[PDB]
Structure formats: C-alpha cells, structure tokens
Amino acid sequence: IMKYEASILTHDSSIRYLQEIYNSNNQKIVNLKEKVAQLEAQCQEPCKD
Amino acid sequence: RKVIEKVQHIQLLQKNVRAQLVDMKRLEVDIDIKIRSCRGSCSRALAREVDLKDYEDQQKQLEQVIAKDLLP
Amino acid sequence: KHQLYIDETVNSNIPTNLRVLRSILENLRSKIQKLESDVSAQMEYCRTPCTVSCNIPVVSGKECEEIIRKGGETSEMYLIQPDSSVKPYRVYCDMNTENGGWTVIQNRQDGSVDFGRKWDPYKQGFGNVATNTDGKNYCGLPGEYWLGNDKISQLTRMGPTELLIEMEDWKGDKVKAHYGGFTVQNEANKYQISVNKYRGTAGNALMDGASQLMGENRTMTIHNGMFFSTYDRDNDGWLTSDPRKQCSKEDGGGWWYNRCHAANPNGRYYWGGQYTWDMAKHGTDDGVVWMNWKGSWYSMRKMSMKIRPFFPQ
Amino acid sequence: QLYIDETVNSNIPTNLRVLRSILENLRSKIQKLESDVSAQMEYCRTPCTVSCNIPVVSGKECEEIIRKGGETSEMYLIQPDSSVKPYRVYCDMNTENGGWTVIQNRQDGSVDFGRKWDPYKQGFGNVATNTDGKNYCGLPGEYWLGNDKISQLTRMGPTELLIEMEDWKGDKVKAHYGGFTVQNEANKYQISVNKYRGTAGNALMDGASQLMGENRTMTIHNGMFFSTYDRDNDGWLTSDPRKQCSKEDGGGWWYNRCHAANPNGRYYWGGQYTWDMAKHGTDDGVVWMNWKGSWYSMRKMSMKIRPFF
Amino acid sequence: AIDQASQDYNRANVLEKELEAITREQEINRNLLGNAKLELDQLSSEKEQLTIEKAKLEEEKQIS
Amino acid sequence: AIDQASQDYNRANVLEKELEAITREQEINRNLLGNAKLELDQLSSEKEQLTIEKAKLEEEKQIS
C-alpha cells in the first residue's frame, strides 16, 4: 500500500474523461437530431411532374 | 472507502452508456429510413448499408461485463 | 485469515472495465461521424428535386372501373373524376390484376416516401402516383402513395365498393384480403372505416382482430368501425387521459386505431423485414405490420390497397 | 496551370509530425520538473546540520591566529575590534604562507548567491562543515563573509588579496592584489585593489582582456560601487528596468558596465553555458573573463585576505 | 481535443498487432520446450543403442 | 482531454518501438523449422542404427 492511493487517481481521470466523452456525445446527438428534422421537411415533396 | 465510492460513479456511468448505446441504434435506423424516404423527393439517393451485427456484438459485451458490485 | 482479505484484484478487473467502456464510447464517436457525414451528403442532394414526365393518357372516367370498360386496358396512371363538382385527379389503375378496374389508393415497395405525416397531409393525400417506366413517355410503374382521405371517402361513399389488400414478405411470398364491403366516412365522422364480406389468404385482421391475442386482448385489435388518427390528431380507442396512451406517436403513420392495431400498412418501412423493440423510435410496433400473417415485429416488403365498385355478385 | 501546390500539402504532414513531437516532448518535461521540485520540497522539511567545535586559539584575524600557534586549516572564531561581536570564519593556513582569512568561497554551488542587498551586508552561507568522522569542521563551505564585515577587516590596515579558481578540466590559476580596501555602507562598499600579479589576468583594474577601448574601460571593477538585484549602483546612470547589471537571481557585486568578472555569479555545471541557458540571456555566472571567456562559469572560486608585509 | 484523444486511439491498432504477434511467438515458445526435450530424448536412447552393440560385438570374439 | 491525447500518443510511440523488437525473434523462427530437419538428422540415424543391431542379432542365433 502506497500506490493503492495513487491508482485511484490514475483511475479517476479515467472516469471524468469517460464521462466527458459521454456528455459530448449526448450533446452531439441532440445536435444531429436537429439536422434530421431539417431533412424531413426536405423530403415531403413529390417528384416534380 | 474511496474504492467503494468509485463503483457508485462507474455504474451510474455504465447504466448511462447502455442508455446511449440504445439511442445510437434507434437513431441509426431512424436515419437509414428517413434517407430512404427521400428516394422520391430528391434527384439522388444515398447508397448505404447498416451493420447491426456490430451493435449486438458490443451489446453482447457491456452486459457480459456487468458483474456483481460490492455487496457481499 | 479474515484480514488478508482486501480486494487488490479491483485493479485487474477495472482495467478490463475501461478496456471496454472506451472501446465502446469511441466506437460510437466514429459512428456519429458517419451519420453526420450522410445526413450532409443527402442534404446536398436535396437541393435539386427528382423529375417526372407524366403524359396523362387520353381515356378518362369516374373511376378506374369505367376506364377499363372505356377501352383502357393496361396498368398505368390515369386521371379520373368521380363527381362533376370535384376537380379531377391522377391515379394508378391496376388492370392486369384479376379483372382490372382497380383504383390503387395506397402503395408501398421501397419506402421511397415518408408516411409519418400529420392529419392534413393525410386528408389531402401524398406521394408519387407513378414513375416514368425506363425509357418511355408514359408513367408505367407505380410509386408509393396514399391517395388521401377526403378522396378515398367519397370514392367509396358513392355506391357499394369492394376493397383489396396485397402484401409481401422479404422472401417473396404473397397474400391478399378482399372485403366485398368498404366505407370511409366524411370528416365530422372522423373518417370512420367499416368493412365486411372478408375472404382471402391473409386473415381478417380488420374485423376479427389479431390471430394470437385472445379475449379482451383481441377485441382491442379491431379496426372495423374505427375512427382515424395521426400523430397530431388523437382519435384512437383509448380513454385513459395521458399523452402516453396515443396509438399514433411522432414519426408513426396515420390509420384507424383502436388499442391499438392488428395491422398497419401506413407503418414505417423497416428494411429486411425483421425489426426488434430496440430499433423502433418508441419501442412499439410501428412498422408495415399485418399481424394475422407475420406477427408483430415484421415490416412488409410490399403492400397495396386497391378498390373497385361492387358488381360480381 | 501546372502550378498546383498540393505539394505544400505533403510537407505540412512532415511538419506537424515534428511540431507535435516537440510540443509533447516539452509537456512530459514539465512532468519531471513538477515531480522533482515536489521531492526537494519534501527533503526541505528538515534542515541539514553541523556540529562545529570552536577551537581555543582566537584573535583579530587569521594571521594573528597562525602567529599564535594555530597551524591547521579549519573554522576559527575571531574578533577584530573590541566593540564588535566576535564571529566564526574559515582560515587557510596552508597556501603560500598561511594566515589567509577566506571571505568568499565556491566549490559545489551549495548556496544561493543571488541574494538581496541586506543579506549581502551581514553575510550568508556555510562557513565550514564536519569532515570525515572528525569533530572539527576542517572543510570550507560556500559563503560570503559580509560587506560590513569585509569593510572593516580591510579598513584596519594594509590588506593584500588572493583569488583562486579552477576550471572543469582540472587547471588552477591565481590573482594576487598587494592592496585592497572596501568602504562602509554610506560609501556603498566601494572597492579598490592594486599591486596585481599572477596567472589569471588583472580582471579588476584592466577590464576584460578580449575587449577594446572604451568598451573595455567600462568593464573595470576597481573603484566601483557595490550593487545587488534590489539595489542598483552600477555604471548605468541611465535609469531603466532594462539596464541593470544585477537582475533577479544574479549575484551582487562591484558592477561597472558590466563586468570582467563575477565570482558571486551562478554555478552552472559542466562549464560552458550559452545565452538560452541564462534566465536573462546575460553572462551572469561564475566568471573571470581574462582567463576562460564570457560564457564559462568556474568550477571553484575563492577570495582570501591577510594583511601585508 | 477529445477528437484528438479519440484520434490517437488508434492505440489499440498497434496494441492488437502484438496481441496477434506475441502469441505467435508464444505458440513457438512451447515448441522450444516440446522439441528440445524430444531432441535430447532421441539422444539418450540413441546413445544406448551404441552400448548394446559394443556389449555384444565382443561375443563374436568367443565364436572362434 | 489533452492529458489523454498525450498519454495515448506516447504509448503509441512506445509500441512503435516494441513491434520492431519482436520481429528480430521472428528471425529465430526459421531456426526451429531448421530443427525438424535436425530431428530427421537423428531419426534417420536411429532407423540406421536399429537395422545395424538386428543385422548382428541374425548372426548370434545361428552359431548356437
């Protein structure tokens, strides 16, 4: 016991960073959800006769 | 004391990751459909595939990994 | 020894918990990459619409029936006019199928059209009626559409009209389902459906209900005598007052909904057929579904709705 | 239009490869330095100690002491004036004729010499340290005696001076000064050596030997005032935060404009040190120009006195 | 930055080129033992067939 | 984030230098395959010694 109080940090960065990716993706997703709603309105028109 | 407080985070995390891994499936589909739904509106249509075998290969994991915790 | 116990191994089972948790979160990044890229390429394609040259053929009529009698005898798009106080409109008549005179009022075959529409687009109709067959001047092939409500209502409201429904699984077997009686009502009667005189290889999902659900649980998958509802207009058989008991939710098709369905041809076109609970937007069964022949998690490859007036006896 | 420079886009690769393998070399450098300055700060929880057994033979200075039978090099205690509290001091009783009273020493950079005005007046550093297993401190420490203290030692009469120094190759050379005087504080410890002789070049009266004309005359220490990083008395009467000889973390000295020598300079290891190593891009190290150069700091460096016969 | 991190992982790209080359060197590491045993196995019995000949050829002297 | 980028960068660059280190032991792979020919070196000298023994046996049984 010495680094059994040091590895909790080597494995605490790897929590706050994992949560960081996640939180970005949950934002990046709620962003691509707007950009789909903008492809819906664009695909309602029947082929031009 | 500390190593116990970690799991509380490392599980609220992993339960959130499966919740996101869900929507990345629901979306990838909702997308493959809404693009197909353009074939008859727009001059060109995007020629694509959907690899689901991947999603259920890393849904195979995560769960196969969700072991016990710290109770006994 | 009950004190030489400490879990030092929570240092070999945590590496193998981020060795995965990152191999997953970063593999979802490179996915949001690819989806962002595609919704962009198509968004650029959708600057310039597709084109059709639909040369309305000579012979008209009231309905696709008249048109076959009136010497029109191949399957393509025609214009028709029921009553005189109605502006004419186009339609694809099936002439080859059985004895012709078939007024196609719904079609699916490649998902090419969105069906997750509000009340109004369903009231007016929507989608492609037909498409320029290869290198010809007449639109010979049909396109996915829904001929619209007001139009489909009156078109039966006239005299005895018989309904027909074909469909296909992704292996290429088909079935049908005739209904020697058919009625859709006006608007203030919430476009109330009503059928009878069933026969055919697909199972009377519209009057009897689902083949698998029984008792009270089947009496709720009955489409007969049902009002019409869309994701913005709630007119389903539910009377539990909550925005979580609507049969039609966002991005779901409009149909005659009870509690809820034995069949939905206005579903969402899931490719490959097989579609699980965690693919659906709401987790529900919202696809091109005819329960009585394929279950609850199967979206039909093809599905059409053709009608004709009542004569054969 | 054969002028397409998609070539300017296949050396940005080779470029960014470098500029990352540089910026992320320097990052893991600040790693080791964050780490080490942390470790030293822990060793510096508890001071180093010495047990210094004051010899019996006293006096006014280290000549008296060698005449009074005290015949080995170690710390002694001395009292030059009656009304001036006695103080410890190292004496060299072995060089030429003994009787030397060391007032400045350098040999391992074990002392921070870049100190303010006040800490230059009193003095600072280790006067000597316990040797081997012996009970007397028979080895010298790095120190500056003290201005006040050096002022009066010389102002007592004809005091000579010896200056020793070693390079890192193993060579030594001396620099005598038959005369030597340092005034008090209201006279800004004004030096003034003379009667020079030796093998290390009169850096103090002549200026730097590789200089010329006026630009050499302005590197003469002789007759100079004394200045330290917080108190300025160099040649530059031009007041500006840019024209000081003694800048932050640089030894106080008899600075002109600026120096032919600074033994109160900083202890660069190895010897050779260049402009990018210096905090201020100056020649702030342990330098005696007239022998080694302008970018070379000395291995050893010692300043001893002993009244003149 | 995240895009950079993720870009530099990667990582596994290089790691699993060893998880697929180390074991390749390990399968043949038991082919050091499982062969340097059978190689020196062949030796002792080979040496003992030499001894059976000598403690036999001497009996041909007793013939005549 | 950056801490991570760097951590990954370096571990990658460390791995670069380890993949080149194992591929000098792949040199000594063609040395083990060079011992199946040194097995047959003694396997054939056994078949060669064996047939020498029972050629001597045929002779002692005919002097009795």
Swiss-Prot record, chain A:
* Entry's localization field: Secreted
Q: Provide the taxonomic classification.
A: Eukaryota, Metazoa, Chordata, Craniata, Vertebrata
Q: Which disease is it linked to?
A: Congenital afibrinogenemia: Rare autosomal recessive disorder is characterized by bleeding that varies from mild to severe and by complete absence or extremely low levels of plasma and platelet fibrinogen.
What else is noted?
The gamma-chain carries the main binding site for the platelet receptor.
Species annotation: Homo sapiens (Human)
Q: So where does this one cross the membrane? A: none
Record-given protein name: Fibrinogen gamma chain
User: How is this protein organized at the quaternary level?
Assistant: Heterohexamer; disulfide linked. Contains 2 sets of 3 non-identical chains (alpha, beta and gamma). The 2 heterotrimers are in head to head conformation with the N-termini in a small central domain.
Gene field:
FGG
Expression by tissue: Detected in blood plasma (at protein level).
Curated annotation (Swiss-Prot), chain B:
**Posttranslational modification, per the record?**
It is well known that heterologous expression of isolated domains can lead to adventitious protein modifications.
Organism lineage reads as: Eukaryota, Metazoa, Chordata, Craniata, Vertebrata
The protein's job, in short, is: Cleaved by the protease thrombin to yield monomers which, together with fibrinogen beta (FGB) and fibrinogen gamma (FGG), polymerize to form an insoluble fibrin matrix. Fibrin has a major function in hemostasis as one of the primary components of blood clots. In addition, functions during the early stages of wound repair to stabilize the lesion and guide cell migration during re-epithelialization. Was originally thought to be essential for platelet aggregation, based on in vitro studies using anticoagulated blood.
Question: What organism does this protein naturally occur in?
Answer: Homo sapiens (Human)
Give the comment on domains. Answer: A long coiled coil structure formed by 3 polypeptide chains connects the central nodule to the C-terminal domains (distal nodules). The long C-terminal ends of the alpha chains fold back, contributing a fourth strand to the coiled coil structure.
What this protein is called in its record is Fibrinogen alpha chain
Give compartment(s): Secreted
Subunit structure, as described in the record: Heterohexamer; disulfide linked. Contains 2 sets of 3 non-identical chains (alpha, beta and gamma). The 2 heterotrimers are in head to head conformation with the N-termini in a small central domain. (Microbial infection) Interacts with Staphylococcus aureus protein Fib; this interaction inhibits fibrinogen-dependent platelet aggregation and protects the bacteria form phagocytosis.
Q: In which tissues is it expressed?
A: Detected in blood plasma (at protein level).
From Swiss-Prot, chain D:
Give the principal location in a single coarse category: secreted
Q: In which tissues is it expressed?
A: Detected in blood plasma (at protein level).
Superkingdom assignment: Eukaryota
- Positions glycosylated per UniProt: N215
**Which GO cellular component terms, listed alphabetically, does the Swiss-Prot or TrEMBL entry include?**
blood microparticle; cell cortex; cell surface; collagen-containing extracellular matrix; endoplasmic reticulum; external side of plasma membrane; extracellular exosome; extracellular region
Disulfide bonds listed in the record? C52-C137, C62-C91, C245-C258
Describe the effect of L204R: In CAFBN; abolishes fibrinogen secretion
User: PTMs?
Assistant: Conversion of fibrinogen to fibrin is triggered by thrombin, which cleaves fibrinopeptides A and B from alpha and beta chains, and thus exposes the N-terminal polymerization sites responsible for the formation of the soft clot. The soft clot is converted into the hard clot by factor XIIIA which catalyzes the epsilon-(gamma-glutamyl)lysine cross-linking between gamma chains (stronger) and between alpha chains (weaker) of different monomers.
Keywords from the named record: Adaptive immunity, Blood coagulation, Coiled coil, Disease variant, Disulfide bond, Glycoprotein, Hemostasis, Immunity, Innate immunity, Pyrrolidone carboxylic acid, Secreted, Signal
Per the record, the coiled-coil ranges are 1-43
Gene Ontology biological-process annotations: adaptive immune response; blood coagulation, fibrin clot formation; cell-matrix adhesion; cellular response to interleukin-1; cellular response to leptin stimulus; fibrinolysis; induction of bacterial agglutination; innate immune response
Report the residue ranges that make up the Fibrinogen C-terminal domain in this protein: 53-309
Protein location: Secreted
State how changing T228K affects the protein, per the record. In CAFBN; homozygous; heterozygous; no effect on fibrinogen complex assembly; impaired fibrinogen complex secretion
- Molecular-function GO term, any one: protein-folding chaperone binding
Q: Implicated in which disease? A: Congenital afibrinogenemia: Rare autosomal recessive disorder is characterized by bleeding that varies from mild to severe and by complete absence or extremely low levels of plasma and platelet fibrinogen.
Under which name does UniProt file this protein? Fibrinogen beta chain
Source species of the chain: Homo sapiens
Q: From which residue to which, out of the full length, is covered?
A: 180 to 488 of 491
